[PDB]
Write a protein that binds this ligand. Structure first.
Ligand SMILES: Nc1ncnc2c1ncn2[C@@H]1O[C@H](CSCC[C@H](N)C(=O)O)[C@@H](O)[C@H]1O
Ligand SMILES: Nc1ncnc2c1ncn2[C@@H]1O[C@H](CSCC[C@H](N)C(=O)O)[C@@H](O)[C@H]1O
Lengths: 272, 198, 273, 200
C-alpha cells in the first residue's frame, strides 16, 4: 500500500492543455506535465493559462527513449494525434500510414517506453483519442497496435456540439455511461452572448448558426469556447485573432468528455 | 551471454515476416531440410496477428522482416511493413526475467521513401546498413538493413550515396525477384550461437 | 424635506466602449437611463454585449434634435470626449477645432445647452467634457470660452501605468480635489502583463516593444492593454474582434480609474445599490 | 409671437452687431439716429464673455455676418457662426422677463455645404436665399437665418444650389474688391418698425 502522490503526466499532441485544465479543475495535484506540442499559438495558451507549470518539449519525433526515462516516470500518458488525414470529411486524406496519420505510431512508440517494465506493478494509465470517421482498417490497425478496442464518446451528451470520438486506453471506467452535469451547457443557446438567438439546439463540427437582430452571424470565440466547455476567454492569448483561436478550438478535446474520462483518476492520486 | 560448446547448441527458432527466408537459411545450415515444420514460422499478412499468436508460435531466437522487392507492385504503404514488423517484434522479445540470445533484422529493398527512413531508424534504434550489389563500377541493386546481429555494420558501403539510391529507386523500378544474395550472408555470425547442419 | 436620491440619467456623447456606464455601475450608482451617441459599430458591440442592452444607442450626434433631447431627457449628467485626431500635435496634418472631427466639440456644446435645466429649475445637473492636453493654445481657449469654464488636467499616470494627460472641463463635484490612487490600481506596467513577461519601463507612453519575454521583444497584448487603461480583462473580447480593432478602441478611451475619480462624488447625489 | 404697442411707447432698438457693421443700413431705415449710440459693434469676440454681453446690453437685435464673398477670411467660416451662436445665447432675455428679441446671421456664400448644415441645426431653421437679380441673371446672393417675422418670404426658390455654387466659383476668382451686399439684407429689418422707434 502506497500513499497518494501527485500525478505525473506525459501529453503528446497536447494542444491547448486540455488535459491539464481538466486535471486541475478535478482537484488532482499535478507533479509533472510534460507536453509535446509544436504549434506556437497552442504553446502560448498553455504557458500563460497555466503559468509555466507545463514543461514543453516540442516535436514528438524528437523524444528519445532516454528522454522518457529522464522526464519520467509517468503515471499517465495521453495523446490525440492530428486527424485530418484519417477523416472521411477530407477527400484528400492519406490515411494511417502517410501524412500526419502516421503520428499515431509515435504515440504507440512512446507509450511502450513510458510503460512500466516487468516487475513494476505501479499504476500506469494512458488514453489515446481519434476521430470516429476513419477507414475501418485504420480503426482496426490502431486497435491492434494499442491492443485494445475503443470506446465511443460523443460530446453531444455533455456539450452543445456534435463531436464523436474514439478513446482507446486503460483508464478506470471508460465504459461507464456518460452522465451530464448541472453546469454543462447542453444546448447552443446556453453558449451564446447577449441578444443572440440559436438557430439549432446542437451545432455540428449551417455555416451561420446564430441570428442577431433578425440577421445571420457566425459564432464568436467566447461562444465557441463554451461549446467546447473551455472557460470563457481561455484562448484570448498573445493577440490571437478570430481565425487562430477557432483553429485551436477546432482541434480540441471537448473538456466535459475529458472530465468524464479523467474523473476516476481522483481515487488514485493526491488531491488538494 | 554464456557461449555453449557445439554439442547441445539448439536449432534457431525463426519467425519470418512478409518475405520467407526458410531456404536462404537452410542454404547456410541453420534449418535442417525435412526437419520439424516448426523451426520456422512464416506469416505474410500480419493484419490480425495478435500478441498471443506470436507467443504460441514461439519462442523465437530470430525475427526477420523485409519489404517487397523493388519492382514489385506494392499494395500496402511501405511503412506498414516497418510498423507491423516492430509491432510483432515486441510480442516476441524475451521477458526481462528470462533473458536469452534474441536477434532481429529488418531489410528494405528501397521501398521505404526518405521520410519513412527516419521513422524506421527511430523505431529500430539504429541507422541502416547499405549493402549494395555493385557490378562494373555501377550500382545495380541495394538493400538497407536494421539488425542487432553482431557484424551487420561491417557490410556497409559508405561509397553509396543517398541520391545514388534514390535515382536507382526511380530508374530501375520503372523498367523492372528478391535480392536475397545481399542479405543471405549477414546471418553467418549467428552460426556460433545455434546448431549447424551438414 | 430635501430631495430623494434617484437613479442617474445619463447622456453620453461619443460614448466609445461605454466607459461612463462601466464606471457608474462599478461605483454602485443606479443608472435609470444611459443614452449613448456612438457611430463605430465595434464600439457599439462592446457596450451592447458587456452591458446587456441597458444602453440606448442613438447613432450620429448630428442627428439628435432639440425634440430628441426633451423626449429622451431629462438628463442629470451629460458627458463627452470628442475625437482628438485633429486637435493634437501628434498629427502634423491636423486641422484643429473648427474643421475635421475637431468641430464635433460644438455638437457637445450644442446639446449640453439643450439638456441644461431652465432658469427656474434647481435640480441637480452635472456635465463633463474631455480632450487631449496636446492642443493649440487657442483651441483650449475657445473650448473654455464656449463652455464658460476652465479645465482641470488629470494625467492617468497617477492611477494607471500610462502617460495619458487630458483636460476635463465640467461641474462635477470635487473635480479639483487631488487624485489619490486606490489599493487595487495597477500603477507600474509590470502589474499589467501576463505570466513570464518583464516590463522594460515602469510606465507606458500614449520602446515600440515595451515588454521582453524569453529574451526577445514583443508588443503589448490586448489583455494587458485593457489592464493599462483600467478596464476589466477581456472587456473587448467581443464579436470576433482582432488585435487591431481592440487596441483601436482602447487607444481612444478614457482611463477607467480617472473617470472613477471624477464620478465617485456622484454617489452622494444619486441613488445607489 | 409678440404684441404691437403704440408709437408713443416705442423705444430705440438696441443692436449688437458682430463681425460686420450694419450701422449705416440701420440709420438709413430710421432705427438709429443721425450722429451719436445704440449699436455695439464688435469685430473680434474671442475674449468676449457672457458678462461682457450683459454689460453692453441689453439688446433687442443681434446681427452677425460672414466676410464678403471673395475676401479671403481671417478664419474658418464656421467660426463666425459658432461665435455668433455663442454670443447670441449671452444676449437672450431670461425667461423671467420676456420681451421682443430678434437675431439674424447672414452668409455671403462663404459657408460650404458642410458648414451650411451646421448653421441650420444650430440656428434651428433652413436658410433664406435672398438674391440680387438683374436682367434675369444672378448678380449676388446671401443666405439668411433669422427670427424676424417676414424673413421666409424673401426666399427665392428659383435660385438653385448649382447656380449659387457657380456664382461663388466666379466671384471668388474675380480680382476686384469684395463688397458686402448689405442692400440684400437691409430690407429684412422693416418688420421691426412695429416694435421700435422710427426716426425721421
Ligand atoms: N510532430 C508533432 N509533434 C507534437 N505535436 C504535433 C505534431 N504535429 C502536430 N501536432 C499537434 O497535435 C495536435 C493534434 S489535435 C489534438 C489537440 C489536443 N488533444 C487538445 O485537446 O487541444 C495539434 O494541435 C498539433 O498542433
Ligand atoms: N460624428 C459622430 N457622432 C457620434 N460619435 C462619434 C462621431 N464621430 C466619432 N464618434 C465617436 O466618438 C469617440 C471619440 S474618442 C472617445 C471615446 C470614449 N471617450 C471612450 O472612453 O471609449 C469614438 O469612439 C468615435 O467612434
Amino acid at each position: 500500500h502506497m500513499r497518494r502522490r501527485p500525478i505525473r503526466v506525459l501529453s503528446l499532441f497536447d494542444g491547448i492543455a486540455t488535459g491539464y485544465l481538466v486535471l486541475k479543475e478535478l482537484g488532482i495535484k499535478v507533479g509533472k506535465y510534460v507536453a509535446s506540442e509544436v504549434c506556437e499559438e497552442s504553446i502560448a495558451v498553455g504557458t500563460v493559462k497555466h503559468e509555466g507549470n507545463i514543461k514543453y518539449v516540442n516535436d514528438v519525433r524528437n523524444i528519445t527513449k532516454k528522454n522518457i526515462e529522464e522526464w519520467g516516470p509517468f503515471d499517465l500518458v495521453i495523446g490525440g494525434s492530428p486527424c485530418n488525414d484519417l477523416s472521411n470529411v477530407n477527400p484528400a486524406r492519406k490515411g494511417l500510414y502517410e501524412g500526419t496519420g502516421r503520428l499515431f505510431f509515435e504515440f504507440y512508440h512512446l507509450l511502450n517506453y513510458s510503460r512500466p517494465k516487468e516487475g513494476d506493478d505501479r499504476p500506469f494509465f494512458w488514453m489515446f483519442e481519434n476521430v470516429v470517421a476513419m477507414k475501418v482498417g485504420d480503426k482496426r490497425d490502431i486497435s491492434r497496435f494499442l491492443e485494445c478496442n475503443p470506446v465511443m464518446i460523443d460530446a453531444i451528451k455533455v456539450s452543445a456540439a456534435h463531436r464523436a470520438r474514439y478513446f482507446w486506453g486503460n483508464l478506470p471506467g471508460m465504459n461507464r455511461p456518460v452522465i451530464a452535469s448541472k453546469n454543462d451547457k447542453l444546448e447552443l443557446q446556453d453558449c451564446l452572448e447577449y441578444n443572440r438567438i440559436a438557430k439549432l439546439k446542437k451545432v455540428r463540427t449551417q455555416l451561420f448558426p446564430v441570428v442577431m437582430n433578425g440577421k445571420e452571424d457566425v459564432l464568436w470565440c467566447t461562444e465557441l469556447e463554451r461549446i467546447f466547455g473551455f472557460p470563457v476567454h481561455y484562448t484570448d492569448v498573445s493577440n490571437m485573432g478570430r481565425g487562430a483561436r477557432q483553429k485551436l478550438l477546432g482541434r480540441s478535446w471537448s473538456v466535459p468528455v475529458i472530465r468524464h474520462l479523467f474523473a476516476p483518476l481522483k481515487d488514485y492520486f493526491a488531491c488538494e | 551471454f554464456e557461449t555453449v560448446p557445439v554439442w547441445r547448441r539448439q536449432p534457431v527458432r525463426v519467425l519470418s515476416l512478409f518475405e520467407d527466408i526458410k531456404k536462404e537459411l537452410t542454404s547456410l545450415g541453420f534449418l535442417e531440410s525435412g526437419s520439424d515444420p516448426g523451426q520456422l514460422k512464416h506469416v505474410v499478412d500480419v493484419t490480425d496477428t495478435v500478441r498471443k499468436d506470436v507467443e504460441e508460435w514461439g519462442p523465437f531466437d530470430l525475427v526477420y522482416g523485409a519489404t517487397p522487392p523493388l519492382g514489385h507492385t506494392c499494395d500496402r504503404p511501405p511503412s506498414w511493413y516497418l510498423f507491423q514488423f516492430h509491432r510483432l517484434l515486441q510480442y516476441a522479445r524475451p521477458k526481462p526475467g528470462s533473458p536469452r540470445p534474441f536477434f532481429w533484422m529488418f531489410v528494405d529493398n528501397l521501398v521505404l521513401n526518405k521520410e519513412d527512413l527516419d521513422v524506421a531508424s527511430r523505431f529500430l534504434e539504429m541507422e541502416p546498413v547499405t549493402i549494395p550489389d555493385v557490378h562494373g563500377g555501377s550500382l545495380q541493386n541495394a538493400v538497407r538493413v536494421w539488425s542487432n546481429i553482431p557484424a551487420i555494420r561491417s557490410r556497409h558501403w559508405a561509397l553509396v550515396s543517398e541520391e545514388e539510391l534514390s535515382l536507382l529507386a526511380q530508374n530501375k523500378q520503372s523498367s523492372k525477384k528478391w535480392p536475397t544474395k545481399l542479405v543471405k550472408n549477414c546471418f553467418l555470425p549467428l552460426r556460433e550461437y545455434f546448431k549447424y547442419f551438414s
